Each structure stands twice: as C-alpha cells, then as structure tokens.
Amino acid sequence: MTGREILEKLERREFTREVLKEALSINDRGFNEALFKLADEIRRKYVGDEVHIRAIIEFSNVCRKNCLYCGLRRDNKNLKRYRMTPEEIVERARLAVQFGAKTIVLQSGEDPYXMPDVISDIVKEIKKMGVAVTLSLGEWPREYYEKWKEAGADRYLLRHETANPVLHRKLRPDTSFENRLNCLLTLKELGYETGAGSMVGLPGQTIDDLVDDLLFLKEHDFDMVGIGPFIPHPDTPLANEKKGDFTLTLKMVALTRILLPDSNIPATTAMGTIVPGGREITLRCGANVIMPNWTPSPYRQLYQLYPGKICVFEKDTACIPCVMKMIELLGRKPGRDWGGRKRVFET
Numbered sequence: 116m117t118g119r120e121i122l123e124k125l126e127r128r129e130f131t132r133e134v135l136k137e138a139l140s141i142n143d144r145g146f147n148e149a150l151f152k153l154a155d156e157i158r159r160k161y162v163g164d165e166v167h168i169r170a171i172i173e174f175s176n177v178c179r180k181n182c183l184y185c186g187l188r189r190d191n192k193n194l195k196r197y198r199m200t201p202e203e204i205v206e207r208a209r210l211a212v213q214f215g216a217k218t219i220v221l222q223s224g225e226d227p228y229x230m231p232d233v234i235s236d237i238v239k240e241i242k243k244m245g246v247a248v249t250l251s252l253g254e255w256p257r258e259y260y261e262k263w264k265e266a267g268a269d270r271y272l273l274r275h276e277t278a279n280p281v282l283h284r285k286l287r288p289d290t291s292f293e294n295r296l297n298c299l300l301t302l303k304e305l306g307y308e309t310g311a312g313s314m315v316g317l318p319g320q321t322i323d324d325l326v327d328d329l330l331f332l333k334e335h336d337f338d339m340v341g342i343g344p345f346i347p348h349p350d351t352p353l354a355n356e357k358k359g360d361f362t363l364t365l366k367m368v369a370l371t372r373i374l375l376p377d378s379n380i381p382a383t384t385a386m387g388t389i390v391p392g393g394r395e396i397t398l399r400c401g402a403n404v405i406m407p408n409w410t411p412s413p414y415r416q417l418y419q420l421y422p423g424k425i426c427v428f429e430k431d432t433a434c435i436p437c438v439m440k441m442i443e444l445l446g447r448k449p450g451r452d453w454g455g456r457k458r459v460f461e462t
C-alpha cells in the first residue's frame with residue numbers, strides 16, 4: 116500500500132497486522148508527519164489538552180533481577196546502591212503534593228527489603244494526602260499486589276518490555292513473558308489501573324516484533340502505555356549495542372494513541388534523554404502524561420537504568436515547576452483531577 120492508503124486505513128480503524136507493519140516500515144517524511152498529526156488530533160479529541168503530572172520517586176536502586184539492558188541489574192558492581200527510609204519517602208511525597216502533584220509514583224528495583232509491608236505502610240500514609248498512588252516495583256506474588264491494593268494503591272506500571280517470548284526470556288533471564296503477562300492480568304483483576312508498554316530498538320527485536328507489541332496492547336486494552344527507546348548502559352552486557360531510534364519510537368507512541376484513543380500515554384524520560392526536547396515532541400504526537408523526576412539528592416544520579424538521564428544534576432525540586440512551564444509553552448493545561456482513565460465506549 117502507499118502511505119496515503121495506510122493513513123486512510125488507520126483513519127477507518129482497519130488495524131490489521133499488514134497496515135501496522137507498513138506504517139512502521141515506511142520512512143517517508145510526509146507520511147510520518149501525517150501519522151503524527153493524526154495521533155495528535157485523536158489525543159486532543161479523546162483526552163483533551165490536559166497533561167497529567169505524575170511525580171516519580173525512585174526510592175531504591177537495589178535489584179535482585181539481572182535484566183540484560185538495565186544498569187540496576189544485580190551483576191553491576193560499579194553502582195553505589197541506596198535505599199530511602201520509609202519516613203524520607205513519605206515526606207518527599209508530601210513535598211510533591213505541596214508542589215501540586217496529584218499522582219505520586221513510587222518506583223524501584225526489585226528490592227526485597229520493603230516487600231510487602233513497608234510499601235503498604237508508605238502507601239497508607241501517602242493516601243491520607245488525597246492523591247493517587249501508582250506503584251512500579253516489578254514482579255511480585257499476587258498476595259503482595261493484593262495487600263498494596265488494600266493499602267490504597269490506585270495504579271501499577273509494569274511494562275511488558277517485549278511481546279516476543281523468546282527475546283523476553285533471553286533479555287530477562289530470571290523470568291518470562293508468561294510471568295510478566297500473568298502479573299499484568301493479576302493487577303487488572305485486582306482493580307488496579309494498569310500500565311504496560313515496551314522498549315523500542317532492543318538487540319534482536321524486529322519491526323514484526325514491534326507490530327506484535329502494538330497488537331498485544333490493543334488485545335489487553337491497558338489503561339496506560341509507557342514506551343521508550345532502548346538506551347545501552349556501559350556496565351551491562353548490551354553496552355556495545357545500538358541505541359533505539361527516536362523517530363521509530365515516536366511512531367510507536369503515535370500508533371498506540373491511534374489504537375487506544377482514551378489511554379494515558381507518557382512522554383517518557385528516555386525520549387528526552389536521546390533527543391533534546393524529545394518529551395515535548397512526544398506530547399505533540401499522542402502523549403498526554405509526563406513524569407517529572409522527584410527523586411531527592413543525592414540519589415538521583417544513582418538511579419541509572421540507562422546513562423545520561425536528563426535532570427540528574429539539577430536541584431531536586433526543579434522538575435515539577437519545569438514541567439508546568441513546558442505544559443504552558445506547549446499551549447496545553449495542567450491536569451485538574453487525578454487524571455484517571457476516562458473511558459469513551461465505542462464500536
């Protein structure tokens with residue numbers, strides 16, 4: 116098909132494997148710009164001009180897993196490890212709420228120390244502040260997820276990473292795609308607003324794999340989808356592999372908006388790391404959420420999933436005001452409520 120014909124099929128919601136493959140394979144500038152415009156319009160029509168701010172506290176970089184792409188992998192001995200205390204985490208969340216955050220995101224490596232009860236205690240304290248709580252702690256037993264839901268957690272982010280089970284097992288040797296999916300299904304069953312998503316440009320990953328990611332997201336109708344480029348980290352086995360392409364990753368965000376028009380989709384920090392102004396671009400191509408870094412000094416620079424992460428050298432209260440300025444200069448508005456998914460039922 117020509118670019119014009121693929122756009123017309125996307126506009127009529129004929130989301131076949133062939134249409135998605137062709138959309139990802141065409142490199143024409145006119146086609147790409149029209150795809151980005153379509154996603155931007157679908158975003159405005161379905162989720163409006165509000166950009167929801169999720170203040171993220173990366174509270175521990177301790178991890179038991181050995182994911183091949185990740186700087187926090189347990190075999191990385193060249194990383195200073197840290198843990199915030201429960202009191203530090205609560206008080207830091209309180210500061211974010213004082214600065215206007217309406218969602219607090221707690222993210223960490225898979226650090227057993229806190230699980231499950233210290234997390235439960237922390238969640239209960241933050242929920243007293245009248246904001247949404249989102250967890251991003253990795254793979255744990257159903258019983259842990261249940262306890263956190265009972266403690267008041269609202270949402271859980273657990274990117275599926277790659278929907279190719281063979282590639283998944285190789286990159287994430289402690290676990291499997293089956294396990295990841297079982298975790299996501301359990302979270303949904305428990306009533307969490309659930310987030311999935313993937314990296315783009317992983318070693319071994321093909322365009323067909325990317326199409327399968329899109330199809331997987333459509334199949335499960337996730338509330339949130341987090342997408343970023345793979346960024347090689349020098350203290351990992353993938354150090355010499357090629358970085359993910361920004362434009363290809365941007366096309367994955369645009370298609371995700373087109374496929375899931377009422378979902379919440381972040382402009383991820385990885386997008387801002389690989390291209391200056393990458394998050395702003397992404398907010399104009401389908402994204403409607405941003406997650407300013409609220410990890411306190413002196414730990415920001417130690418949370419090194421990937422190198423060169425933006426904002427790590429700044430005073431640690433910088434990013435909430437910064438994203439508020441960003442939202443304004445984009446001609447957008449800040450979120451007025453917790454920014455939960457507002458489903459638009461259709462055919």
Ligand SMILES: Nc1ncnc2c1ncn2[C@@H]1O[C@H](CSCC[C@H](N)C(=O)O)[C@@H](O)[C@H]1O
Pocket residue numbers: 184185186222223224225251252253254272273274276313314343344345346347348385420421
């Ligand atoms: N090198 C890298 N490049 C880009 N993104 C990466 C990365 N290493 C990790 N990430 C992303 O960072 C996300 C958060 S990892 C921290 C949360 C939890 N330990 C978990 O694994 O879910 C991952 O889901 C992954 O997509």
Ligand code: SF4
Pocket residue numbers: 178179180181182185186187188189223224225253
């Ligand atoms: S991606 Fe998550 S689980 Fe895997 S090594 Fe990094 S922090 Fe640990």
Ligand SMILES: [Br-]
Pocket residue numbers: none
């Ligand atoms: Br302070």
Ligand SMILES: [Br-]
Pocket residue numbers: 169218220249270
């Ligand atoms: Br969230």
Ligand SMILES: [Br-]
Pocket residue numbers: 255256
């Ligand atoms: Br366990």
Ligand SMILES: [Br-]
Pocket residue numbers: 272340341342381383
């Ligand atoms: Br995300």
Ligand SMILES: [Br-]
Pocket residue numbers: 343383384385386
């Ligand atoms: Br990211």
